[PDB]
Amino acid sequence: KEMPQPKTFGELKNLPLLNTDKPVQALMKIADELGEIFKFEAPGRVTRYLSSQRLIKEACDESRFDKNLSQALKFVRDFAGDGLATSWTHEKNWKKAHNILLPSFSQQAMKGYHAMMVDIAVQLVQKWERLNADEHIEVPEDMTRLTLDTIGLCGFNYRFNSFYRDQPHPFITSMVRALDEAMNKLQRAYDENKRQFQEDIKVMNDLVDKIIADRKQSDDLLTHMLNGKDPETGEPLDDENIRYQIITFLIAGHETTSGLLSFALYFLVKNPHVLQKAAEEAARVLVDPVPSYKQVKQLKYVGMVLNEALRLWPTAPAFSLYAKEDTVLGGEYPLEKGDELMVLIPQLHRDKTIWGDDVEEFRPERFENPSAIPQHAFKPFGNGQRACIGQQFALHEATLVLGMMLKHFDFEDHTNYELDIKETLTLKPEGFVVKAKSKKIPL
Amino acid sequence: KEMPQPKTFGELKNLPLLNTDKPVQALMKIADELGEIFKFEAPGRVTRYLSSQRLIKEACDESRFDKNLSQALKFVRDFAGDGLATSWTHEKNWKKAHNILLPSFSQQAMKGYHAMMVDIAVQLVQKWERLNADEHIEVPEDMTRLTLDTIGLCGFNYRFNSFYRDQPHPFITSMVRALDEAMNKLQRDDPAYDENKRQFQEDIKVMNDLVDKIIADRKSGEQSDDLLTHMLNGKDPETGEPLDDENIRYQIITFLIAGHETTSGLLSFALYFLVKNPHVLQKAAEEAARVLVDPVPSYKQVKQLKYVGMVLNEALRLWPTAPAFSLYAKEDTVLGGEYPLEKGDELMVLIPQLHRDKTIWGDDVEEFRPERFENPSAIPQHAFKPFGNGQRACIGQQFALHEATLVLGMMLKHFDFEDHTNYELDIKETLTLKPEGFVVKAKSKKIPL
Ligand code: HEM
Numbered sequence: 001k002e003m004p005q006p007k008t009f010g011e012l013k014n015l016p017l018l019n020t021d022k023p024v025q026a027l028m029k030i031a032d033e034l035g036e037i038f039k040f041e042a043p044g045r046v047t048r049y050l051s052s053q054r055l056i057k058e059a060c061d062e063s064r065f066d067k068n069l070s071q072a073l074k075f076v077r078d079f080a081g082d083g084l085a086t087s088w089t090h091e092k093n094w095k096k097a098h099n100i101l102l103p104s105f106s107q108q109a110m111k112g113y114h115a116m117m118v119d120i121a122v123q124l125v126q127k128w129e130r131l132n133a134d135e136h137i138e139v140p141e142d143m144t145r146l147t148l149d150t151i152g153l154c155g156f157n158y159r160f161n162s163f164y165r166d167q168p169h170p171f172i173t174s175m176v177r178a179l180d181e182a183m184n185k186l187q188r189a190y191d192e193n194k195r196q197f198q199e200d201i202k203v204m205n206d207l208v209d210k211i212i213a214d215r216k217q218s219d220d221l222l223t224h225m226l227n228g229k230d231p232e233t234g235e236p237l238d239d240e241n242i243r244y245q246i247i248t249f250l251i252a253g254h255e256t257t258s259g260l261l262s263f264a265l266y267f268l269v270k271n272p273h274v275l276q277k278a279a280e281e282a283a284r285v286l287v288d289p290v291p292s293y294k295q296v297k298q299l300k301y302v303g304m305v306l307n308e309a310l311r312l313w314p315t316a317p318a319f320s321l322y323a324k325e326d327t328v329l330g331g332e333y334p335l336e337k338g339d340e341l342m343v344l345i346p347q348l349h350r351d352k353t354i355w356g357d358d359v360e361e362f363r364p365e366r367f368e369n370p371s372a373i374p375q376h377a378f379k380p381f382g383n384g385q386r387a388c389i390g391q392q393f394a395l396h397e398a399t400l401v402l403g404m405m406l407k408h409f410d411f412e413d414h415t416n417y418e419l420d421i422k423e424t425l426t427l428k429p430e431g432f433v434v435k436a437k438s439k440k441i442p443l
Numbered sequence: 444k445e446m447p448q449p450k451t452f453g454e455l456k457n458l459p460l461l462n463t464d465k466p467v468q469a470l471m472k473i474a475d476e477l478g479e480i481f482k483f484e485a486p487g488r489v490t491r492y493l494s495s496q497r498l499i500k501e502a503c504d505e506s507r508f509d510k511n512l513s514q515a516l517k518f519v520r521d522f523a524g525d526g527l528a529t530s531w532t533h534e535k536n537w538k539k540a541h542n543i544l545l546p547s548f549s550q551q552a553m554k555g556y557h558a559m560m561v562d563i564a565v566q567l568v569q570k571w572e573r574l575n576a577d578e579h580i581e582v583p584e585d586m587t588r589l590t591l592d593t594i595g596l597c598g599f600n601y602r603f604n605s606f607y608r609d610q611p612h613p614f615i616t617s618m619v620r621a622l623d624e625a626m627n628k629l630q631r632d633d634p635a636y637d638e639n640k641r642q643f644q645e646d647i648k649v650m651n652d653l654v655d656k657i658i659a660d661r662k663s664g665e666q667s668d669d670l671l672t673h674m675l676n677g678k679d680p681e682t683g684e685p686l687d688d689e690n691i692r693y694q695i696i697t698f699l700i701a702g703h704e705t706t707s708g709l710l711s712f713a714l715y716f717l718v719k720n721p722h723v724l725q726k727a728a729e730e731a732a733r734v735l736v737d738p739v740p741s742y743k744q745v746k747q748l749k750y751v752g753m754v755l756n757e758a759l760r761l762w763p764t765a766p767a768f769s770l771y772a773k774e775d776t777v778l779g780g781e782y783p784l785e786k787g788d789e790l791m792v793l794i795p796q797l798h799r800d801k802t803i804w805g806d807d808v809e810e811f812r813p814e815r816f817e818n819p820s821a822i823p824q825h826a827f828k829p830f831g832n833g834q835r836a837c838i839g840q841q842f843a844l845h846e847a848t849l850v851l852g853m854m855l856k857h858f859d860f861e862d863h864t865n866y867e868l869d870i871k872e873t874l875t876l877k878p879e880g881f882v883v884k885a886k887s888k889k890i891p892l
């Protein structure tokens with residue numbers, strides 16, 4: 001009944017615990033010591049970190065809890081505005097944009113994006129085909145090139161041309177630096193940081209606003225946003241919110257997905273039996289020079305590989321909730337209306353009462369039957385109506401790309417890479433490098 | 444442009460294809476062979492059976508198509524009259540009764556019915572608690588006992604007392620036999636059927652007399668929490684008129700018909716799929732045990748049975764118990780850019796085939812996976828139509844789902860279930876679907892009520 005709490009620093013409470021460059025991993029170690037729930041206090045804030053499926057399944061009851069904006073999301077809101085990811089459920093523009101954008105993110109809508117996804121995927125394969133002997137691949141760097149270009153092209157028919165560049169597009173230079181400022185604000189004379197923050201926002205707004213005005217018909221999210229009408233209110237999105245959605249998609253739909261592909265390839269080369277099984281499926285299914293949409297749907301084991309990578313290292317590692325009314329959590333922890341919760345997704349996914357004792361082992365077979373998995377044990381894309389709208393976009397892209405990678409190359413962990421997980425607002429294996437030996441299969 | 448059509452029987456055209464005791468399943472096999480649309484002809488009848496979401500989403504455009512009375516509904520109309528289910532949209536009594544009855548069927552209105560639903564649900568659980576060892580449960584029989592008694596009690600405060608009976612109430616014998624005659628007339632006029640006509644009329648009077656007597660007795664003036672009170676006191680905001688007593692009897696007959704066998708079929712199919720998929724049953728049983736913490740479920744607790752509702756929707760996907768509805772073109776129009784239709788042309792929506800459209804659901808359409816419904820927004824529009832379409836959709840949808848969720852939740856809370864015969868799915872067809880001969884054994888968890 002009495003809730004554990006990690007060590008405190010006087011008036012700063014638990015806040016200095018987050019003044020570390022791997023805060024999610026630090027919070028995981030605290031959950032290892034304190035268990036399924038612990039209070040976390042900072043000046044002017046109290047929240048509770050949940051780690052067990054037993055409690056999180058209650059937290060996912062939408063009649064009792066709604067999405068809360070974490071401090072990280074509040075800081076992101078300063079440039080993502082009331083886009084889907086940084087708006088409250090009760091804000092008019094959330095449900096409005098939600099209704100308008102849902103059809104453009106369906107499994108059926110992936111059929112229209114598939115050709116543009118293949119466009120970027122082929123560029124990745126050709127880059128690796130064109131490496132010299134003994135050259136190596138910087139995996140998260142190239143995965144980010146792919147996912148950024150894919151969302152730019154599928155999102156608003158814009159080619160960032162990341163595979164033609166060493167220095168990334170000036171838009172994401174500001175975006176990454178804005179996200180870095182948002183995260184660093186958490187861990188805290190700083191007047192220069194404020195001036196820098198506004199300059200990075202202006203870079204993002206101007207480019208996006210230019211593309212909207214330039215456009216104002218293709219098979220991209222922008223067209224759907226300019227012409228879509230909310231069935232409920234009958235209203236279309238206004239131009240300001242449309243810019244926020246584009247910024248949101250550019251943020252929300254590149255770095256989490258590239259982290260997924262990076263972790264997936266990491267786990268594959270660290271588990272050669274799993275890599276072989278996935279590569280055998282890729283050769284068995286991808287019989288054409290270009291994968292088709294239906295083919296990608298047949299890459300079942302590759303899809304399991306991705307889910308298992310999302311289990312161990314979910315690249316959006318937490319989300320926040322608040323109690324809609326007074327309620328009792330787990331029959332032991334009474335909560336008042338407005339009390340806040342954090343779902344520590346990587347710790348949830350290590351709940352031995354759900355996954356067995358081998359939680360740290362990479363076994364895609366865990367996901368052969370979704371019905372064998374208890375409710376709310378696997379939450380890499382969030383929960384309920386506030387779940388990731390881009391889930392099917394992310395999984396189709398990652399399955400297509402990973403399938404093509406496994407079809408066309410053998411991979412070598414030539415440095416015996418030691419996993420080092422860099423933390424921004426997302427997770428990625430820093431410095432992960434491999435060598436790819438081409439199988440000489442043409443495109 | 445050229446439309447497929449199944450084999451013909453000379454002058455009878457395709458009609459003998461329906462002279463089979465499983466016509467829906469036969470039409471499903473025809474759709475498997477011919478695809479998303481096929482013409483079906485009978486003497487004096489032409490229709491087109493739709494099976495793909497691509498075509499059915501257009502058919503569900505209410506600006507282009509309106510509800511048509513199928514031949515099945517026309518025969519039901521001989522005793523359901525101009526009740527809600529057997530009336531044309533343009534008939535004055537449809538919109539009148541629709542406006543009057545809609546508030547008494549809302550999700551909000553279920554709060555007032557909940558106690559009566561629990562009354563019958565407790566009777567079901569107590570019957571199963573009182574079985575002897577190695578005795579078994581006749582599932583659709585007991586589900587029909589429950590859903591009939593629930594609509595009788597919630598409908599007009601009448602207790603059929605089905606759990607005290609082997610032979611059903613004389614009203615229900617006539618109703619089923621009237622429904623059988625209506626369905627048999629589709630398969631079918633000569634002197635051999637003359638006894639059928641006299642019996643049909645005898646069954647109509649049995650239904651009318653009971654209902655009309657109940658209406659007259661109540662008009663003592665007492666007020667209960669039932670549809671009958673709402674119908675005697677409700678006024679259509681449009682016309683300012685209340686329903687007359689004749690239409691009220693047709694509505695009561697309609698509710699007893701429309702809302703007992705479809706709901707009991709749902710519960711029967713749901714339990715069947717549960718015992719055939721132990722992983723799903725375990726997951727559903729965990730939720731029931733966690734949520735239903737009191738001896739009597741509350742309304743709010745039933746709303747918390749999310750996975751149970753997912754189980755019900757997935758059972759409704761595979762075997763929608765009202766398996767079809769009919770439409771007609773309001774004007775000349777082209778369906779799917781290739782099938783031109785003239786005003787008055789008829790369409791049938793073959794719901795079980797729609798729910799097997801691989802282009803919507805993937806290749807695993809035949810597998811029972813409630814997780815398909817984990818997030819409702821992933822379901823395309825008009826891909827899932829177990830309750831019909833638009834303003835002519837099932838008015839009792841919220842009633843049926845609340846009853847079925849409450850009862851299934853209580854069943855999973857109180858018993859472990861065994862498929863002791865390794866039951867082989869055999870779907871009996873009336874105007875609705877049910878798994879004939881489905882039996883299980885229940886081992887009580889000894890949780891008191
Ligand atoms: C592996 C890749 C991805 C992961 C792990 C992921 C994860 C998540 C999570 C956990 C949330 C819930 C956040 C919260 O509750 O605060 C979320 C929301 C969201 N994601 Fe993703 N995501 C991924 C890819 C994408 C993509 C590709 C897009 C866009 C194309 C996208 C757009 C969004 C949006 C708009 C929301 C907010 C939805 C709403 O609240 O209406 N994400 N994502």
Ligand code: HEM
Pocket residue numbers: 510527528529541594697698701702703705706709763764765767768769828829830831832834835836837838839840842843844
């Ligand atoms: C799982 C259970 C049920 C299913 C699958 C179901 C299915 C349907 C379908 C498909 C229709 C449309 C018929 C057509 O378009 O020709 C319909 C209409 C109707 N149902 Fe149900 N139903 C169920 C339960 C109920 C219940 C419990 C009631 C009453 C308490 C009810 C009363 C009605 C009525 C009155 C209509 C006609 C509505 C109108 O046209 O105004 N049904 N139902």
Ligand SMILES: O=C(CCCCCn1ccnc1)N[C@@H](Cc1ccccc1)C(=O)O
Pocket residue numbers: 018040042045047070071072073186252256316317318319342425426
């Ligand atoms: O744990 C986190 C991680 C942020 C989640 C990632 C956001 N995402 C969602 C989708 N794509 C990215 N954030 C807390 C830390 C904190 C706790 C207490 C006091 C101050 C800060 C917060 O921001 O409140």
Ligand SMILES: O=C(CCCCCn1ccnc1)N[C@@H](Cc1ccccc1)C(=O)O
Pocket residue numbers: 461483485488490513514515516629701705765766767768791874875
């Ligand atoms: O497909 C059907 C099934 C009837 C659906 C059940 C009605 N329901 C709705 C809600 N609760 C019951 N009926 C056709 C068969 C037919 C076709 C051509 C010629 C003659 C008969 C029809 O009746 O017209």
